[PDB]
Amino acid sequence: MVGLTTLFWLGAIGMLVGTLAFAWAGRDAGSGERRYYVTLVGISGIAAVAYVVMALGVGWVPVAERTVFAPRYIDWILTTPLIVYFLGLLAGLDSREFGIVITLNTVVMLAGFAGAMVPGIERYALFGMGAVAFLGLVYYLVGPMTESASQRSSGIKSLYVRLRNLTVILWAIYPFIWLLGPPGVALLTPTVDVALIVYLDLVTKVGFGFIALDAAATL
Numbered sequence: 001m002v003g004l005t006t007l008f009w010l011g012a013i014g015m016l017v018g019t020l021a022f023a024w025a026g027r028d029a030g031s032g033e034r035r036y037y038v039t040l041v042g043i044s045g046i047a048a049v050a051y052v053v054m055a056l057g058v059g060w061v062p063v064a065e066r067t068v069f070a071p072r073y074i075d076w077i078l079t080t081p082l083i084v085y086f087l088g089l090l091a092g093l094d095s096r097e098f099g100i101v102i103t104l105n106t107v108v109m110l111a112g113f114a115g116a117m118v119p120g121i122e123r124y125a126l127f128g129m130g131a132v133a134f135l136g137l138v139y140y141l142v143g144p145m146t147e148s149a150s151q152r153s154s155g156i157k158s159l160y161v162r163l164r165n166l167t168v169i170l171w172a173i174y175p176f177i178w179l180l181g182p183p184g185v186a187l188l189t190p191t192v193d194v195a196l197i198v199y200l201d202l203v204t205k206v207g208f209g210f211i212a213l214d215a216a217a218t219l
């Protein structure tokens, strides 16, 4: 229990550091720019709360012979569409296309959560639904959204592509962790699972936010 608790506290601290840095960076509150900072504060702030809750030993749900971390999935349901929103803003995406990518994202996270909570082998059908919706989300990120980003200045398009790449490459690792970890075949221990996810969560949220902060200043 000590290892898992320690990892969750590390996640909480890293998320808190991001949250404070984004809130501070955003204080200037430029009318067009404010939205981006508030969104980053929401992304890392919600994650911080989730990690604190888990560190305190809340929401460790036993499912068959594994443990499900409910706050992790609730976190993702809330924070991943905020990341997609940030990317859609950057890309200058149209309202229909925003709706589509937010829908596909929500399918991924709901299917992953539901799958984690189903004891039997039918849970892999839920994983599959999420994997299919994720391929759709990736298509949008690398296709239509990238085309949309090209209507922006070269610097904004470069930022879009940088954050798009970070997002696509790291998000693609999560389903493999689900499959190899406790929700799937339970090869990886809960500690190894949590350690990998803490890194990935930190980089996809904080380590995404700092890249945007850097580009925003350099712009």
Ligand SMILES: CC(C)CCC[C@@H](C)CCC[C@@H](C)CCC[C@@H](C)CCOC[C@@H](CO)OCC[C@H](C)CCC[C@H](C)CCC[C@H](C)CCCC(C)C
Pocket (backbone or CB within 6 Å): 041, 042, 045, 046, 049, 050, 053, 058, 059, 060, 061, 070, 071, 072, 074, 075, 077, 078
């Ligand atoms: C906008 C809405 C339409 C979307 C709402 C999200 C919704 C879709 C989530 C669906 C799942 C929902 C049905 C939950 C059911 C889970 C339940 C079956 C699990 C069993 O319950 C286990 C409990 C305690 O043991 O864990 C319980 C887990 C914890 C109690 C919850 C974990 C906390 C969250 C991860 C953090 C939430 C964010 C903060 C409330 C806001 C922080 C703001 C920030 C800026 C400081």
Ligand SMILES: CCCCCCCCCCCCCCCCCCCC
Pocket (backbone or CB within 6 Å): 010, 011, 013, 014, 015, 017, 018, 195, 196, 198, 199, 206
């Ligand atoms: C300006 C730099 C600020 C960076 C934001 C993150 C703050 C550091 C918080 C500690 C992070 C813990 C490291 C966990 C890594 C993933 C699990 C590794 C276990 C081997």
Ligand SMILES: CCCCCCCCCCCCCCCCCCCC
Pocket (backbone or CB within 6 Å): 176, 179, 180, 185, 186, 187
């Ligand atoms: C482009 C592909 C990248 C290579 C990654 C390899 C694929 C990862 C395999 C994940 C699912 C395989 C399930 C078999 C795991 C072994 C079962 C052990 C039981 C505890």
Ligand SMILES: CCCCCCCCO[C@@H]1O[C@H](CO)[C@@H](O)[C@H](O)[C@H]1O
Pocket (backbone or CB within 6 Å): 132, 133, 135, 136, 137, 139, 144
């Ligand atoms: C959920 C899985 C979805 C699979 C990804 C295929 C979606 C892309 O499919 C494409 O959509 C375009 C809209 O931008 C259309 O113009 C194209 O005709 C169509 O091929």
